[PDB]
Amino acid sequence: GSSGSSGALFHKKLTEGVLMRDPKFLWCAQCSFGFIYEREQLEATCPQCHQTFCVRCKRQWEEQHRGRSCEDFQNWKRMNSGPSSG
Ligand SMILES: [Zn+2]
Ligand SMILES: [Zn+2]
């Protein structure tokens, strides 16, 4: 037997006059400011709280997080900051 099925105009069609779709809505997790960052980094800073927080897990950034991901980072917290992080 066999399977498979793929086909869309999103292959050889370039975007045109498309300014409706939203880029990246990055905001705090408490104040929920609301500002676009669409940046290639994980060191976002709120224009109000001025607190560095990840743009993915939306958690208090950490030097250890740098280079790693929300997943790997967490594992480091449970290991380093014991089973119960303060
Ligand atoms: Zn904020
Ligand atoms: Zn993260």
Q: Per the annotation, where are the binding residues?
A: 28, 31, 46, 49, 54, 57, 65, 70
Residue ranges making up the domain that contains 36: 1-86
Please give the distance, rounded to the nearest whole angstrom, from the Cα atom of residue 45 to the centre of ligand 1.
8
Q: Is 42:56 a contact under the CB 8 Å cutoff?
A: yes
What span, in angstroms and rounded, lies between the C-alpha atoms of 53 and 35? 13
What span, in angstroms and rounded, lies between the C-alpha atoms of 22 and 38? 10
Residue of 69, 22, 61, 63 whose CA lies nearest to 45: 61
For the chain, the domain total comes to 1
Please give the distance, rounded to the nearest whole angstrom, from the Cα atom of residue 65 to the centre of ligand 2.
7
Method: NMR
Ligand nearest to the CA of 71: 2
Beta strand 25-26 with 52-53 is: unpaired
Max alpha carbon distance in the chain (Å)?
A: 59
Structure tokens at 85: 């992080």
